[PDB]
Design a protein around this ligand. Structure first.
Ligand code: GEO
Ligand code: GEO
Lengths: 182, 189
């Protein structure tokens, strides 16, 4: 099916934007970021644990993120258009890269996650037809986060870092059709 | 797309490498798959096996994640041969090795739960071919001696206690069963 990925920083407006599509649920496969799964891995909130102790929990959290995303990407649909919030690509190019850069993933941990990504991309073609990038400034992103969880103590520098990674990927073509919304 | 497949299972020091070498003269008809130790030793220059033995609380989860991946790659590896024989499996990883790291505290609940979600999704996504298991049944002490009598490597300091627990887990799975056809070989010889 035709596949659209909604990408953007934390606090870039994706959840509000996606709520619009909650009424097209019989023409469109609407796959919202599985944060509820991440908050409840048979009683364990991996999202909370990662934010609390990244050096310990970034690895298993991102591994579980990789799996949930992989599930969403490969889920069957009759609908002729699929819309997904985030992807295995942003997990890899932005989130995992940043955790490597900031030291939360030691080399062997980074390497394990990379081998999974390589294996997935060799075993299957993941459908990405269109990327919609909700582009924001880290300041704007920071303020959405504060005007509304586990993530509320993200520093601005962390948002700045995730911002440039999205810019590198989606504007400057430093990683592998992109529509840039404001 | 997979041939009749035999998995060779046993404790560390149960004689699996020696046993598997007997099938090398039959490589015309047998796809022979050694446990992917060489991969684990060199994950883009990182030895995950050594790191796991050095500090299991830190490295058990990424190590067993990569083990899963490499076993998956062996299970699914393409062959024209009539028979595939594999050293260990995604089953011993899950039911023995991960189970013991969970019990001894190297894997916390969330870490264990992540690996289990992977195993669940793998068994929903593919049928892993497993037609026969050959269990090399040894006593922990003989396994222990075997390890101590051979070249120094990452596992050379595994305690007898660790071996004893792995033994009971192999017994749970392959004898009591207890876990979801086994030929039992006396490998204490
Ligand atoms: N690959 C990913 C994807 C998402 N997240 C985090 O999940 C929360 C909800 O989007 C956000 O707090 C978050 F974006 F930071 C993450 O840490 N890594
Ligand atoms: N799932 C698995 C499979 C194997 N191993 C370990 O790998 C080494 C070589 O057999 C042995 O030291 C070993 F068997 F312990 C492991 O830790 N976890």
């Amino acid at each position: 099916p035709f596949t659209v990925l909604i990408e953007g920083n934390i606090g870039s407006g994706k959840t509000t934007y996606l709520n619009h599509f909650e009424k097209y649920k019989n023409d469109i496969c609407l796959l919202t970021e599985p944060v509820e799964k991440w908050r409840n891995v048979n009683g364990v909130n991996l999202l909370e644990l990662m934010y609390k102790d990244p050096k310990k929990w970034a690895m298993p959290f991102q591994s579980y993120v990789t799996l949930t995303m992989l599930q969403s990407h490969t889920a069957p649909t009759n609908k002729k258009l699929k819309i997904m919030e985030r992807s295995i690509f942003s997990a890899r190019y932005c989130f995992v890269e940043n955790m490597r850069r900031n030291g939360s993933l030691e080399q062997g941990m980074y390497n394990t996650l990379e081998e999974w990504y390589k294996f997935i991309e060799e075993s299957i073609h993941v459908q990405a037809d269109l990327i919609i990038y909700l582009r924001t400034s880290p300041e704007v992103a920071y303020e959405r986060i504060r005007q509304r969880s586990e993530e509320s103590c993200v520093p601005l520098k962390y948002l700045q870092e995730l911002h440039e990674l999205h810019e590198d990927w989606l504007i400057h073509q430093r990683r592998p059709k992109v529509l840039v919304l404001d």
